[PDB]
């Protein structure tokens, strides 16, 4: 499960996953801010719960 | 452009099985009709070059034909003159066949000239 | 100053700190025909670190 | 008719190589050129032009341009309004992509329509 569409969810393969992870890392590099790390920390806590 | 069409139609297909509206149905039918019209017009505008190529190649025959008539009449008149002053049977027989053959050839060339236009 | 092909004033709220000029037209070579599409230039002022 | 061609050529060759004249070679060359011209015309006989493809579907084909123009700006206005009204992110992106595609297709069809006429 790698995407979302109206009326259900979508699926993909390993290549989509790796490309998505690389794009997420690149966008993390391009858009740094303290809000990002704060949101990441508390979102990690909520996700663990 | 075709890839854009297929992406657009695939995206619009998923807003119908999660909602309800005849407007998007008519809209999708209208896009597919437009796509059919455009890719029909494609080969129609592609084929236009061959017509002009044929028209261009058809123009040279018109100007070789005039020279052919000139050659025909010149050789006819000179062959008749040569026939007039000969004193050998071989000569006369060959010239008889020559006149007959070129009369037939000139008739056929005129018929084709009339047909071509 | 950067080259671009996308037309502004279709999504104008995205471009708030840019100046856009129309600087020429581009001939896109395809399977059939010619589809000249204008060409734009984006100008902006920055200073980084 | 062909046997007349070879018979005349052979008789004139026998006539010539026994005794030579300017005009004699002149007629030999002119005859040979006509011979090849007739052969080339005969080769062009069984091919002609392709008039079957020259009379394809073109009668009603010309009048649908105004028909397409009838719904072009209709659908573009519908897309503009529905993009303005909508609130989701999927629909907005789909409508923007459709609008850009339609602008491109409308230019394209107008350009080919102007060029062809």
- Is the separation of the CB atoms in B79 and D27 below 8 Å? yes
Nearest CA in chain A to D88: A6
Method in brief:
cryo-EM
D77 touches chain C (CB under 8 A): no
- Is the separation of the CB atoms in B13 and D116 below 8 Å? no
- Is the separation of the CB atoms in B97 and D8 below 8 Å? yes
Farthest CA pair distance, chain C: 48
Q: What are the residues whose beta carbons fall under 8 Å from the beta carbon of C32, sequence distance 6 or more?
A: B42, B45, B46
Nearest Cα to Cα of residue D105 among B36, C24, C23? B36
Residues of A in contact with D90 (CB under 8 A): 5-6
C12 touches chain D (CB under 8 A): no
Distance of CA D24 to the CA centre of its chain: 46
Nearest CA in chain D to A5: D90
Burial group, residue B85, by CB count within 10 angstroms (0-12, 13-18, 19+): exposed
Instruction: Give the number of other Cβ atoms within 10 Å of residue D105's Cβ.
Output: 20
Nearest CA in chain A to D91: A6
Q: Hey, are the CB atoms on B94 and D11 less than 8 Å from each other?
A: yes
How many beta-carbon pairs under 8 angstroms link A with B?
A: 10
Instruction: Give the number of other Cβ atoms within 10 Å of residue C33's Cβ.
Output: 14
What are the backbone angles phi and psi of residue C33, rounded to the nearest 5°?
80, -165
């Amino acid at each position: 499960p790698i995407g979302e569409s109206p009326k259900g969810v979508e699926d993909g393969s390993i290549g989509k996953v790796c490309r998505t992870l690389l794009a997420k890392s690149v966008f993390n590099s391009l858009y740094a801010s303290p809000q990002l790390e704060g949101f990441s920390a508390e979102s990690r806590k909520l996700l663990l719960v | 452009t075709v890839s854009s069409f297929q992406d657009i139609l695939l995206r619009m297909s998923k807003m119908q099985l999660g909602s309800s509206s005849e407007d998007l149905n008519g809209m999708i039918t209208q896009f597919e009709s437009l796509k059919l019209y455009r890719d029909s017009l494609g080969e129609a505008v592609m084929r236009m070059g061959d017509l002009h190529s044929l028209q261009n190649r058809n123009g040279k025959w018109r100007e070789q034909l005039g020279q052919k008539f000139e050659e025909i009449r010149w050789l006819i008149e000179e062959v008749r003159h040569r026939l007039k002053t000969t004193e050998n049977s071989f000569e006369q027989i060959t010239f008889m066949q020559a006149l007959q053959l070129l009369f037939e050839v000139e008739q056929e060339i005129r018929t084709f000239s009339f047909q071509l236009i | 100053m950067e080259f671009s092909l996308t037309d502004p004033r279709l999504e104008p709220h995205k471009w708030e700190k840019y100046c856009v000029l129309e600087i020429g037209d581009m001939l896109l070579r395809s399977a059939i025909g010619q589809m000249s599409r204008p060409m734009f230039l984006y100008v902006r002022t920055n200073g980084t670190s």
